[PDB]
Design a protein around this ligand. Structure first.
Ligand SMILES: Nc1ncnc2c1ncn2[C@@H]1O[C@H](COP(=O)(O)OP(=O)(O)CP(=O)(O)O)[C@@H](O)[C@H]1O
Ligand SMILES: [Mg+2]
Length: 282
């Protein structure tokens, strides 16, 4: 931990990035936080003033959990400021924000279209694999996410997609039938959500089950229903989605199996940074 402690003086806040459950998250710069570089672009989490003592404590404890993660496909903790107020949690910056928002900016009618076409089949597979790789890492770490969705995935400067955090410490449209029914959460229910993320990716982040109320989705899914394939969705992605949505959780694949299914169609750098190809998984 002390090894993680960073002096407040080294952090410079630049602008608001978004609201976290504990408080505002800002984009900033950190002086000499990573060996080899003078200054690193970073995301800085803070805890709102209206927070109770216990929440300020839980805020730090969460950072402490992340200290144990070293996966290229999960957003990394860079350091923390726990001495004095306000406390800060420095994470690697994901320059393109949450996946959902990123996907909607690539929509033809997007008032903020970055100027490129929607994601290619190749890019979608790369995203799937990266997301699956991060999930496999978390699962190997004994963590069941419970809230996997595009909003909870992030996009780096080089477009690498990573899982935001270790999970939710509600998401009806993303929950597996057994979770909706018995309220049970497993890595298998995380696979179901994973499928909805793929659906989100192919639909450029449309609202799942648009038209149905959370009341109807609840019954629909529990009766065995699932999402319709987006228009002109690539067959290969449709098959992955279908596997993820088998009513019987024992029938769905594992994240490791997802990665294995797509390993021969990824960017060359993948094996050098993936958990799947790392020695922590062999
Ligand atoms: N590392 C990072 N890089 C860039 N933006 C980030 C970031 N971490 C957080 N953000 C921004 O802040 C928003 C909220 O952060 P985040 O989703 O991590 O909070 P959280 O963990 O409290 C959510 P919840 O409790 O709902 O799961 C993100 O949607 C994004 O816009
Ligand atoms: Mg989160």
């Amino acid at each position: 931990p002390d090894e993680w402690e960073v002096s407040r003086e080294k952090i410079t806040l630049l602008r608001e990035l978004g609201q976290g459950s504990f408080g505002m998250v800002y984009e900033g710069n950190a002086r000499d936080i990573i060996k080899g570089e003078a200054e690193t672009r970073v995301a800085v989490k803070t805890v709102n003033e209206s927070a109770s003592l216990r929440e300020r404590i839980e805020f730090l404890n969460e950072a402490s959990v992340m200290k144990g993660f070293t996966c290229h496909h999960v957003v990394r903790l860079l350091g923390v400021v726990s001495k004095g107020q306000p406390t800060l949690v420095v994470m690697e910056l994901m320059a393109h924000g949450d996946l959902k928002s990123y996907l909607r900016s690539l929509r033809p009618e997007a008032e903020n279209n970055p100027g490129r076409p929607p994601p290619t089949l190749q890019e979608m597979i790369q995203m799937a694999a990266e997301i699956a790789d991060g999930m496999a890492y978390l699962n190997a770490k004994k963590f069941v996410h419970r809230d996997l969705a595009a909003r909870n995935c992030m996009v780096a400067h080089d477009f690498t997609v990573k899982i935001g955090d270790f999970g939710m410490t509600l998401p009806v449209r993303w929950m597996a039938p057994e979770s909706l029914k018995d309220g049970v959460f497993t890595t298998s229910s995380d696979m179901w959500s994973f499928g909805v993320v793929l659906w989100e990716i192919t639909s450029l982040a449309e609202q799942p089950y648009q038209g149905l109320s959370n009341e109807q989705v609840l019954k629909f899914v529990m009766d065995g229903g699932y999402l319709d394939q987006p228009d002109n969705c690539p067959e290969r992605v449709t098959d992955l989605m279908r596997m993820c949505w088998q009513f019987n959780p024992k029938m769905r694949p594992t994240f490791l199996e997802i990665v294995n299914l797509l390993k021969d169609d990824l960017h060359p750098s993948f094996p050098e940074v993936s958990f799947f190809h790392s020695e922590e998984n062999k």
